[PDB]
Amino acid sequence: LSTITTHHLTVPPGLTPEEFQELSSSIAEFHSYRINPGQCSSLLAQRIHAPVETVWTVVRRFDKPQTYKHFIKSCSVGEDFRMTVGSTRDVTVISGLPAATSTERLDILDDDRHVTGFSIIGGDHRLRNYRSVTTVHGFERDGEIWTVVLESYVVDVPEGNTEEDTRLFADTVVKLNLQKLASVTETLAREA
Amino acid sequence: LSTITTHHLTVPPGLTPEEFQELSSSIAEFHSYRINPGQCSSLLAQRIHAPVETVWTVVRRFDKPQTYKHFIKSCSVGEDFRMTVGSTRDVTVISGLPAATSTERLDILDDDRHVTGFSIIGGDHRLRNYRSVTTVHGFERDGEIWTVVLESYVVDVPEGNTEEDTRLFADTVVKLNLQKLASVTETLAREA
């Protein structure tokens, strides 16, 4: 019943075909998931007019997701926290429901290829077993540079929800966070 | 136990003191509420670099809230719908919870003073008895014009939530929608 995601075969909304053809191999490598019934997966994309390493400095900051994410009341890490795979963070989410904290584990951190990813290991019943990967990519035309960020996830569809409603919620949130990422990092680039 | 909101006595975040002093009378008139225990109220503000009537054209469009609001899957009005006080709209919200539609009634529509407001009369248990008012205001300095939008609400705090968590949720959503309003209407002004 399990299948393989097809994100690497379709142009993500927002991206040009030409951008996608350059990214196709990277989507297969980092944005491919094993999907079972009762699960759903999406790939989202955002163009940013900022250098790759400027964007990556924000995307890799596992201890401060609120720097580019919405609906975060607080994020606490350990006193001996170090940016290593396997570290965790406790994220308190604003949702209008009673106070709910998610524990998230850092799954990937590749400073050379600009790939990171995390898993919600407990605490969010909207996004049970959420797993996500973000990659950053540089582009150039005629001395003009820009960056594309790709963010994908897989998550369990909660009992009582349709896939479309879980997908639409999770997509809307990723889309909004990527917009904030674009604004934050574009500002950082203009200021130098 | 009931008190009166104090939004007209504090500078809203984002606004300058000078802007507030010009708006103080309008906040008292339109952004004042009777507040009971178990209720909470906020006033949010957004500067927009667009003419008042450009902003008002979007803010008054009760049948298309998705034009400037986030997390809206659909909005349906009647076949014989007319922009009159007492009309309703059914708004389907993206929330990661099972499909939930809110029925909202148009409470105020003043095209001369640029005031509108609505009530959720059923269908959202996060925002039970939510009531909101939006006003639009023009400003000028040395031939440069800009607009300030004020949006306030009162809502019931759900049983099991703190006031701070209901306030933070509702504030975050209003803030994000006002940002979208700013981007949408600024684009409309640049295009003419």
Residue numbers in the entry:
A (entry chain A), B (entry chain A): 28 to 219
The article reads:
The binding of the plant phytohormone Abscisic acid (ABA) to the family of ABA receptors (PYR/PYL/RCAR) triggers plant responses to abiotic stress. In the resting state, the PYR/PYL receptors are monomers or dimers and display a wide empty ABA binding cavity flanked by two highly conserved loops, named as gate loop and latch loop. To investigate this issue, we have selected as a model SlPYL1 which is a tomato dimeric receptor with known structure that is involved in the induction of stress responsive genes and drought tolerance. Interestingly, the analysis of the structure of SlPYL1 shows that Glu 151 is not involved in the dimerization interface or interacting with ABA; rather, it is located in the latch loop.
To investigate the relevance of this amino acid on the receptor function, we generated a mutated version of SlPYL1 harboring a Glu 151 to Asp substitution (SlPYL1 E151D) at the latch and studied its biochemical properties and compared them with those of the native protein. The overall structures of the apo and ABA bound forms of SlPYL1 E151D are nearly identical to that of WT protein with the differences confined to the area of the mutated residue. In this structure, the apo form showed that Glu 151 and Arg 153 established a salt bridge that blocked the ABA binding pocket while, in the ABA bound form, Glu 151 pointed to the solvent enabling ABA binding and subsequent gate closure. Instead, the analysis of the apo form of SlPYL1 E151D structure revealed that the shortening of the Glu 151 side chain to Asp disrupts the geometry of the salt bridge with Arg 153, weakening this interaction and favoring the transition to an active receptor. The increased RMSD of the gate and latch loops in the apo forms of SlPYL1 E151D with respect to those of SlPYL1 shows that mutated protein displays higher conformational heterogeneity at these loops. In addition, it reveals that the native structure displays a well-ordered salt bridge between Glu 151 and Arg 153 blocking ABA binding while the mutant protein displays high flexibility for Asp 151 and Arg 153, thus suggesting that the Asp151 mutation might ease the large transition – of the latch for a productive ABA recognition. Indeed, our structural studies corroborated that the mutated latch loop displays higher heterogeneity than the WT, due to the disruption of a salt bridge between Glu 151 and Arg 153 which is capping the entrance to the ABA binding site in the apo form of the receptor. Altogether, the joined analysis of the biochemical and crystallographic data suggests that the weakening of the capping salt bridge in the apo structure of the mutant protein together with the formation of an additional hydrogen bond linking Asp 151 and Thr 110 in the ABA bound structure shift the equilibrium from the apo form to the active form of the mutant receptor.
